[PDB]
């Protein structure tokens, strides 16, 4: 009746120990996890970031959200200082239920989310703060400036630092020197009652870890990564407007976890409390909103476990045109090129995604050899602004090899769209590679030897 609440989904308490190394954790926890899509951890009870801030001194420009089920939003790009923002959340908490804000409860903001997204008559719009940390808002974790406390040393440099999860060696994404600046770097959420991000995967399936520093819960639905194929056939049928293709504009919706489980999409939630972690694990669809005022902090990042996958969405993105954020190639072969200083687990995994890029590009330059494109000239493809390298029809990001034409200067496509380029005969193309085949296995067998 009403709202069906989602089963919950896997809640975990490292001891110290486990906590320890988070990689080395979220591999444990991993075959459950992935089954649900979300996952929630709470630190053992000494770990306790000191989140120090003036709630005065903190400013940023408020986004402004409409609350309606099916219709399509963007993901995210006056003045608020973090204290004006608290007392207007609150005061609006307080209002809309005619209640103190922590006397609501989840249970009823949840049935009463779900109920306003669906009624059009009602037409609710809420704020919040979403970006990257900057000199005018800053991580709510430890930097490196001022003078800190000893026990904010403590937290400089752990693992679940948020700050740290990008440049950490056993994660993938580490080494990248390509400015993938909202990928690599970490979120600030700032929310009030009802503000919600829609439903969405993260960029090229990675892993996200989403940390909430204080304030009420946070409410989140998951969908594993296996059903994230019928999750969109769903999302397909019952609001087709979000597929419709685009030039950072995908669409995203708001949609009830009963219409998903409806149609037999497995769906669990959780409720997020401040100093507990979120772990949304790959392909795997997330939502939710906030149940008050809160403030949290989230990033991307891949591990050695993702590689593969990593693979298979670039793929999908070709298939899809979906653009790319970053080109895999390029980040498979810069570990590569940094092999002896790599992560010998690491080097391993790298090592057979590298025996598959190059098979497969074996064959591909094979193929577009017997079309008759038969000139042919060294590119160094990372020197190239990410539009200006990207395949003219699926819109993937070329690193390993493009084809190129003197009648259409300056556009490229990759060699699965040799066909797409221009109406010039083939001895007029220009296969422009990064690497021969002969580059190439030396530097699969560095991989090898650093992984023995
Ligand atoms: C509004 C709002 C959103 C959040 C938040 O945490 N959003 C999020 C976005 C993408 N993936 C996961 C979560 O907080 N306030
Ligand atoms: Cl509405
Ligand atoms: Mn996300
Ligand atoms: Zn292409």
Same mark, same amino acid.
């Given at each position: 009746?009403?709202?069906?609440?989602?089963?919950?989904?896997?809640?975990?308490?490292?001891?110290?120990?486990?906590?320890?190394?988070?990689?080395?954790?979220?591999?444990?926890?991993?075959?459950?996890?992935?089954?649900?899509?979300?996952?929630?951890?709470?630190?053992?009870?000494?770990?306790?970031?000191?989140?120090?801030?003036?709630?005065?001194?903190?400013?940023?420009?408020?986004?402004?959200?409409?609350?309606?089920?099916?219709?399509?939003?963007?993901?995210?790009?006056?003045?608020?200082? *973090?204290?004006?923002?608290?007392?207007?959340?609150?005061?609006?908490?307080?209002?809309?239920?005619?209640?103190?804000?922590?006397?609501?409860?989840?249970?009823?903001?949840?049935?009463?989310?779900?109920?306003?997204?669906?009624?059009?008559?009602?037409?609710?719009?809420?704020?919040?703060?979403?970006?990257?940390?900057? =000199?005018?808002?800053?991580?709510?974790?430890?930097?490196?400036?001022? =003078?800190?406390?000893?026990?904010?040393?403590?937290?400089?440099?752990?693992?679940?630092?948020?700050?740290?999860?990008?440049?950490?060696?056993?994660?993938?994404?580490?080494?990248?020197?390509?400015?993938?600046?909202?990928? =690599?770097?970490?979120?600030?959420?700032?929310?009030?009652?009802?503000?919600?991000?829609?439903?969405?995967?993260?960029?090229?399936?990675?892993?996200?870890?989403?940390?909430?520093?204080?304030?009420?819960?946070?409410?989140?639905?998951?969908?594993?990564?296996?059903?994230?194929?019928?999750?969109?056939?769903?999302?397909?049928?019952?609001?087709?407007?979000?597929?419709?293709?685009?030039?950072?504009?995908?669409?995203?919706?708001?949609?009830?976890?009963?219409?998903?489980?409806?149609?037999?999409?497995?769906?669990?939630?959780?409720?997020?409390?401040?100093?507990?972690?979120?772990?949304?694990?790959?392909?795997?669809?997330?939502?939710?909103?906030?149940?008050?005022?809160?403030?949290?902090?989230?990033?991307?990042?891949?591990?050695?476990?993702?590689?593969?996958?990593?693979?298979?969405?670039?793929?999908?993105?070709?298939?899809?045109?979906?653009?790319?954020?970053?080109?895999?190639?390029?980040?498979?072969?810069?570990?590569?090129?940094?092999?002896?200083?790599?992560?010998?687990?690491?080097?391993?995994?790298?090592?057979?995604?590298?025996?598959?890029?190059?098979?497969?590009?074996?064959?591909?330059?094979?193929?577009?050899?017997?079309?008759?494109?038969?000139?042919?000239?060294?590119?160094?493809?990372?020197?190239?602004?990410?539009?200006?390298?990207?395949?003219?029809?699926?819109?993937?990001?070329?690193?390993?090899?493009?084809?190129?034409?003197?009648? =259409?200067?300056?556009?490229?496509?990759?060699?699965?769209?040799?066909?797409?380029?221009?109406?010039?005969?083939?001895?007029?193309?220009? *296969?422009?590679?990064?690497?021969?085949?002969?580059?190439?296995?030396?530097?699969?067998?560095?991989?090898? *030897?650093?992984?023995?």
């Amino acid at each position: 009746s009403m709202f069906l609440p989602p089963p919950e989904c896997p809640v975990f308490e490292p001891s110290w120990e486990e906590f320890a190394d988070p990689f080395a954790f979220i591999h444990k926890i991993r075959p459950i996890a992935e089954q649900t899509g979300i996952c929630k951890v709470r630190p053992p009870p000494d770990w306790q970031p000191p989140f120090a801030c003036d709630v005065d001194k903190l400013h940023f420009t408020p986004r402004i959200q409409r609350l309606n089920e099916l219709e399509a939003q963007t993901r995210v790009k006056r003045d608020y200082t *973090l204290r004006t923002f608290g007392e207007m959340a609150d005061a609006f908490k307080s209002d809309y239920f005619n209640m103190p804000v922590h006397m609501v409860p989840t249970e009823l903001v949840e049935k009463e989310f779900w109920r306003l997204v669906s009624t059009i008559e009602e037409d609710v719009t809420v704020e919040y703060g979403a970006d990257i940390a900057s =000199k005018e808002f800053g991580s709510g974790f430890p930097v490196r400036d001022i =003078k800190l406390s000893p026990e904010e040393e403590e937290y400089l440099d752990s693992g679940w630092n948020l700050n740290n999860m990008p440049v950490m060696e056993q994660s993938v994404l580490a080494h990248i020197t390509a400015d993938i600046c909202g990928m =690599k770097l970490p979120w600030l959420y700032v929310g009030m009652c009802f503000s919600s991000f829609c439903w969405h995967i993260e960029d090229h399936w990675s892993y996200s870890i989403n940390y909430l520093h204080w304030g009420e819960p946070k409410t989140w639905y998951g969908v594993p990564g296996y059903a994230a194929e019928q999750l969109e056939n769903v999302m397909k049928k019952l609001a087709p407007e979000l597929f419709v293709s685009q030039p950072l504009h995908q669409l995203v919706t708001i949609m009830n976890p009963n219409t998903l489980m409806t149609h037999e999409v497995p769906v669990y939630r959780t409720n997020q409390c401040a100093g507990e972690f979120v772990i949304t694990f790959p392909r795997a669809y997330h939502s939710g909103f906030n149940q008050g005022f809160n403030f949290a902090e989230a990033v991307n990042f891949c591990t050695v476990d993702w590689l593969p996958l990593g693979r298979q969405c670039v793929e999908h993105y070709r298939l899809l045109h979906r653009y790319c954020v970053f080109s895999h190639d390029e980040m498979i072969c810069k570990m590569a090129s940094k092999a002896d200083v790599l992560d010998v687990v690491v080097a391993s995994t790298v090592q057979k995604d590298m025996a598959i890029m190059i098979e497969d590009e074996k064959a591909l330059r094979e193929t577009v050899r017997k079309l008759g494109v038969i000139d042919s000239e060294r590119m160094d493809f990372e020197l190239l602004p990410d539009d200006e390298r990207q395949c003219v029809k699926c819109k993937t990001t070329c690193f390993m090899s493009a084809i190129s034409c003197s009648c =259409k200067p300056g556009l490229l496509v990759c060699l699965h769209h040799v066909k797409e380029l221009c109406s010039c005969p083939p001895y007029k193309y220009k *296969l422009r590679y990064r690497y021969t085949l002969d580059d190439l296995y030396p530097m699969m067998n560095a991989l090898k *030897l650093r992984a023995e």
